[PDB]
Amino acid sequence: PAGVKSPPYIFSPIPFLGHAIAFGKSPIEFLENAYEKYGPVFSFTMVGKTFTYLLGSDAAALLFNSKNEDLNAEDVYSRLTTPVFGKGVAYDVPNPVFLEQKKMLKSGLNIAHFKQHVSIIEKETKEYFESWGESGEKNVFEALSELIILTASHCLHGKEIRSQLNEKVAQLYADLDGGFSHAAWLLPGWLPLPSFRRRDRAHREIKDIFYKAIQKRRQSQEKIDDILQTLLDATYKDGRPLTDDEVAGMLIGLLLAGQHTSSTTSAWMGFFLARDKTLQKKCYLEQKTVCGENLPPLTYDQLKDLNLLDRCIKETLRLRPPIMIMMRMARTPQTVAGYTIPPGHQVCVSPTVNQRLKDSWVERLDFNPDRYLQDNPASGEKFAYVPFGAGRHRCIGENFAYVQIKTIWSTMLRLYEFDLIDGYFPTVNYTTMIHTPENPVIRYKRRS
Amino acid sequence: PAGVKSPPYIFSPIPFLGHAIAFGKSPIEFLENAYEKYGPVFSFTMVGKTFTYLLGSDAAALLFNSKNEDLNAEDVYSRLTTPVFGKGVAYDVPNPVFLEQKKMLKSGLNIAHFKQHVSIIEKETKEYFESWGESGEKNVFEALSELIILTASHCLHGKEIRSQLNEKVAQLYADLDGGFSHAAWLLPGWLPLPSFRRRDRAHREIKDIFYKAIQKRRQSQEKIDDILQTLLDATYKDGRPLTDDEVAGMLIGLLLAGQHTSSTTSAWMGFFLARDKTLQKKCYLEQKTVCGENLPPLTYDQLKDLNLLDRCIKETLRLRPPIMIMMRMARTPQTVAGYTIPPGHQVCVSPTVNQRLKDSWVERLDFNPDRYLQDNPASGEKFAYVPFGAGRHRCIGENFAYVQIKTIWSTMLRLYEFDLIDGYFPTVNYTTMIHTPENPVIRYKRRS
Numbered sequence: 001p002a003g004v005k006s007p008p009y010i011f012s013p014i015p016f017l018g019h020a021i022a023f024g025k026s027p028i029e030f031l032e033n034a035y036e037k038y039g040p041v042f043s044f045t046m047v048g049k050t051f052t053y054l055l056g057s058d059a060a061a062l063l064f065n066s067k068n069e070d071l072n073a074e075d076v077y078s079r080l081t082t083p084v085f086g087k088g089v090a091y092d093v094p095n096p097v098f099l100e101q102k103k104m105l106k107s108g109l110n111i112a113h114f115k116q117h118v119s120i121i122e123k124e125t126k127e128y129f130e131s132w133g134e135s136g137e138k139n140v141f142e143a144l145s146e147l148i149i150l151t152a153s154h155c156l157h158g159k160e161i162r163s164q165l166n167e168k169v170a171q172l173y174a175d176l177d178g179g180f181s182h183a184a185w186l187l188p189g190w191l192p193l194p195s196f197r198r199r200d201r202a203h204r205e206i207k208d209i210f211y212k213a214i215q216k217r218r219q220s221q222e223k224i225d226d227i228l229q230t231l232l233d234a235t236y237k238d239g240r241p242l243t244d245d246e247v248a249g250m251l252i253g254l255l256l257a258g259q260h261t262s263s264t265t266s267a268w269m270g271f272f273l274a275r276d277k278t279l280q281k282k283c284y285l286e287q288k289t290v291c292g293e294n295l296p297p298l299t300y301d302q303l304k305d306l307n308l309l310d311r312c313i314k315e316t317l318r319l320r321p322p323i324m325i326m327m328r329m330a331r332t333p334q335t336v337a338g339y340t341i342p343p344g345h346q347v348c349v350s351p352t353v354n355q356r357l358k359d360s361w362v363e364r365l366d367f368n369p370d371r372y373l374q375d376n377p378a379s380g381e382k383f384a385y386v387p388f389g390a391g392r393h394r395c396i397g398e399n400f401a402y403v404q405i406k407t408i409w410s411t412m413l414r415l416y417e418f419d420l421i422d423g424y425f426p427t428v429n430y431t432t433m434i435h436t437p438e439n440p441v442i443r444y445k446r447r448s
Numbered sequence: 449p450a451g452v453k454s455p456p457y458i459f460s461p462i463p464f465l466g467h468a469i470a471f472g473k474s475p476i477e478f479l480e481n482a483y484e485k486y487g488p489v490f491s492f493t494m495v496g497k498t499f500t501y502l503l504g505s506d507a508a509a510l511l512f513n514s515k516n517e518d519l520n521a522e523d524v525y526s527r528l529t530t531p532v533f534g535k536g537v538a539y540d541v542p543n544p545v546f547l548e549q550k551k552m553l554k555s556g557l558n559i560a561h562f563k564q565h566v567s568i569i570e571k572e573t574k575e576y577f578e579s580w581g582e583s584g585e586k587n588v589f590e591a592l593s594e595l596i597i598l599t600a601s602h603c604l605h606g607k608e609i610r611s612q613l614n615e616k617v618a619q620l621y622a623d624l625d626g627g628f629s630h631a632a633w634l635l636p637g638w639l640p641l642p643s644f645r646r647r648d649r650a651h652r653e654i655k656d657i658f659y660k661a662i663q664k665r666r667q668s669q670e671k672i673d674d675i676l677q678t679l680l681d682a683t684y685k686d687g688r689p690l691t692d693d694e695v696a697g698m699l700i701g702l703l704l705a706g707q708h709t710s711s712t713t714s715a716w717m718g719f720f721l722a723r724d725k726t727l728q729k730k731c732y733l734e735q736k737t738v739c740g741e742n743l744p745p746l747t748y749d750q751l752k753d754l755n756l757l758d759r760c761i762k763e764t765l766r767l768r769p770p771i772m773i774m775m776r777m778a779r780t781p782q783t784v785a786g787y788t789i790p791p792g793h794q795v796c797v798s799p800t801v802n803q804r805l806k807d808s809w810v811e812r813l814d815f816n817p818d819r820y821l822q823d824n825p826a827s828g829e830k831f832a833y834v835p836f837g838a839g840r841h842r843c844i845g846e847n848f849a850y851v852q853i854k855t856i857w858s859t860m861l862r863l864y865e866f867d868l869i870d871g872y873f874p875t876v877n878y879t880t881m882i883h884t885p886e887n888p889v890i891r892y893k894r895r896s
């Protein structure tokens with residue numbers, strides 16, 4: 001015991017902003033260079049706050065094993081940066097409660113339901129891309145996100161709600177999250193802020209569609225077995241059932257939480273595959289090898305066996321995780337790689353950086369889905385590959401994501417063959433709140 | 449292994465000087481406050497250089513056990529700050545050689561010679577203070593240093609040289625060291641500096657008195673057994689004898705090295721004793737108890753048994769060591785209390801601070817020579833009480849010092865009884881190069 005034995009602090013010559021600019025410009029590069037000079041654990045200032053980063057699996061442990069009362073999640077957010085769910089749900093309530101609601105939702109996303117989803121997803125994907133004609137050059141990112149709002153609406157909300165979803169309602173979801181929770185690092189909690197009228201309005205409006213549908217279901221009670229159901233049935237350790245709000249709130253939250261994350265990932269995979277033409281063909285041939293030369297309507301059980309397409313996703317998520325930082329506020333001193341983190345610091349982990357770390361991953365920057373066949377830190381280490389989180393803090397909708405993407409990409413990979421427009425592989429765009437692919441226009445043509 | 453894992457660095461708002469002012473104003477206080485905030489090992493800037501301090505016995509170890517090629521002694525000095533010896537001796541030569549010359553000198557300061565000294569010292573002390581009359585108020589510091597130049601000249605140089613020492617020659621010794629080596633911390637090596645004409649002159653002049661006397665001895669070779677002799681006889685692991693210069697150089701060096709150190713200490717003890725009147729009387733009664741009621745001419749063997757007077761010195765040296773910093777330059781990385789000291793840093797230890805450390809010494813700031821009877825860090829720990837240095841780096845003339853002081857103080861304690869002028873206990877004066885007692889005028893009267 002001595003006093004100051006905290007992690008090395010990187011100084012900035014810019015009094016308040018600190019490193020906010022360098023980080024804002026290119027965070028992964030920033031964080032890598034920092035690792036090289038200061039090791040696995042270090043502090044620095046951005047926009048008045050002190051951040052302490054945990055790099056590599058060993059140190060990343062502290063966050064992944066933490067309890068929300070030592071390393072706090074709600075503390076990280078502003079009225080603006082709070083992830084959108086609803087009143088009385090998620091960040092609007094105490095953690096223990098939020099945890100319970102995630103439980104309820106998790107039990108909703110099960111093998112039973114997934115089986116129903118696969119065919120819905122495939123039908124939607126099939127119908128959507130019909131409008132793409134025989135060939136052309138179009139924005140896959142924009143397509144994929146326009147689609148995923150349909151597919152995920154259907155699977156997670158049920159056909160009553162999905163039927164009500166015209167492009168006027170789709171437009172309202174766009175209003176809902178401008179992606180702000182990804183920007184929490186930049187905007188500190190203390191800033192004065194006006195009401196976000198556009199958001200609060202669309203929420204009110206969308207929430208109202210849910211009331212109308214929670215109505216219809218609670219009346220005629222037939223054989224409908226969807227996520228919506230699971231929820232209505234569910235109750236707390238209370239015994240108390242979910243109010244109508246809670247139901248809509250956590251369902252809206254759920255769709256959003258998965259919306260951008262998925263389209264990012266989907267588009268990126270699309271380009272990786274379009275760049276390595278061999279690999280693309282290969283998991284197209286695996287479509288026949290596994291599913292059968294005639295290409296039947298898709299099933300959940302085939303998905304379990306599309307092992308290349310599975311590694312292509314896994315590998316996409318390694319090089320392009322849609323959630324770049326996981327972030328918690330120190331409320332009680334913590335010990336990591338020798339150091340003590342004083343309460344006050346925002347403790348952070350970067351999926352992107354851990355998954356790319358120069359002394360763990362061979363060929364760090366390479367899109368090689370075969371790497372998971374040899375040895376790798378994915379299995380080798382506890383927390384080197386953590387795109388969905390890890391320990392106590394893992395994404396509830398991990399599995400649905402794999403269902404949704406795999407289906408969509410299969411279906412897509414069937415209808416079309418893809419490649420880059422002029423050898424142009426899309427560059428990362430840090431300028432959107434959630435990192436998007438720069439100019440994601442893709443060339444496609446009918447497959448044979 | 450990570451890169452930056454050096455001791456905590458204390459920042460200063462003054463670009464070059466850094467802490468030179470705060471330290472210059474009151475170094476012990478500075479260093480204590482630093483220990484409280486940063487622990488036993490910490491860095492800071494003074495006058496362009498980086499100093500790393502080792503506080504407490506555990507860390508102080510690194511310096512005391514070091515080798516001059518890892519932690520360098522010559523690197524610490526300027527042409528100005530170099531301790532004065534002579535050409536071809538001490539800092540003017542490589543360390544191994546200097547070490548050999550210290551050896552030669554150490555074997556000179558032995559039990560045989562000490563026995564001769566005691567009576568010389570006592571005679572000198574007796575003769576000197578005769579001019580003080582029956583009572584008055586006079587400067588003991590000025591007296592003690594005027595005297596010690598006589599006593600130590602006699603003992604260390606021999607009566608040939610001591611006879612030549614009139615106040616014109618005494619004045620030349622004053623010219624020799626203005627005490628500058630104590631200021632090394634303040635004046636860095638890189639400064640442009642003119643020749644120190646006054647010094648170089650007095651050295652030349654004093655050195656010349658030595659030639660005349662090395663002459664006389666090397667001629668008629670009779671029964672004279674003094675330190676001077678030991679030297680002339682001595683030779684290196686070479687077999688090579690000491691040149692005439694080397695002899696004068698190391699003898700001059702020797703006298704100076706002990707000159708100020710001793711008078712500081714003597715004066716301080718004088719005031720400690722003058723403030724605690726009980727204690728003074730007590731070791732005056734111990735003068736009879738041990739030496740005999742009639743008070744014979746003093747002998748070496750009685751000195752060995754004046755155990756209170758011995759602890760009063762020991763205790764004086766604890767609270768007022770004349771050498772405040774021991775200082776070495778890192779030439780190869782070193783490890784202390786977890787940390788790595790990069791080559792470049794001036795690694796430092798403070799006798800004063802170690803000997804006062806708040807969590808080792810009970811009653812830290814108290815003049816209580818009895819503390820060495822109970823438990824204490826003096827014996828308790830390896831390097832808590834290190835006024836003469838320790839490990840490989842210990843003062844060769846430690847013993848002679850105890851002889852000289854003990855004798856002088858005995859003799860003094862006999863002739864007179866002392867006390868403070870108006871309850872005024874002299875305050876430390878950091879403004880002289882070597883820390884002196886502020887306004888060291890003392891009241892004395894004949895003893896009975």
Ligand SMILES: OC[C@H]1O[C@@H]2O[C@H]3[C@H](O)[C@@H](O)[C@@H](O[C@H]4[C@H](O)[C@@H](O)[C@@H](O[C@H]5[C@H](O)[C@@H](O)[C@@H](O[C@H]6[C@H](O)[C@@H](O)[C@@H](O[C@H]7[C@H](O)[C@@H](O)[C@@H](O[C@H]8[C@H](O)[C@@H](O)[C@@H](O[C@H]1[C@H](O)[C@H]2O)O[C@@H]8CO)O[C@@H]7CO)O[C@@H]6CO)O[C@@H]5CO)O[C@@H]4CO)O[C@@H]3CO
Pocket residue numbers: 006007008009010011012013014015452454455456457458459460461
């Ligand atoms: O003890 C303090 C400090 O010690 C640790 O820092 C270590 C670090 O790991 C190493 O890198 C190295 O430090 C060197 C550093 O790397 C070099 O860059 C350089 O540092 C210079 C800066 O680059 C430069 O910007 C400038 O600093 C100015 C600041 O920009 C400016 O903000 C202000 O300083 C005040 C600060 O505003 C404020 O933060 C406050 O600082 C305290 C911190 O809150 C706190 O983190 C801690 O700092 C530790 C740190 O945790 C360790 O990692 O205590 C701080 C007080 O010490 O107060 C400041 C008031 O001055 O203005 C300054 C200019 O004065 O200059 C510096 C250097 O001149 O050089 C560094 C060494 O030369 O080693 C250390 C080992 O301790």
Ligand code: HEM
Pocket residue numbers: 083253254255257258259261262263265317321322323326387388389392393394395396397398400401
């Ligand atoms: C595209 C791949 C996805 C990735 C990489 C991803 C990543 C993450 C991460 C890192 C977390 C935070 C874990 C924590 O700190 O507790 C998280 C939380 C969450 N995920 Fe995902 N996710 C993805 C898709 C989805 C999908 C499809 C859904 C919906 C079915 C979903 C629903 C949620 C919800 C409700 C949370 C909690 C939200 C919060 O606490 O703010 N995710 N996700």
Ligand code: HEM
Pocket residue numbers: 531701702703705706707709710711713765769770771774835836837840841842843844845846848849
């Ligand atoms: C009054 C009490 C004294 C104290 C507290 C004291 C303290 C010290 C210290 C701390 C050192 C440095 C040790 C090292 O780093 O190697 C030293 C060196 C030395 N001492 Fe003393 N000393 C005292 C008296 C004397 C006396 C009386 C003599 C002469 C007989 C003497 C001769 C020397 C010499 C020649 C050196 C080496 C000088 C150098 O390396 O610069 N000292 N002393």
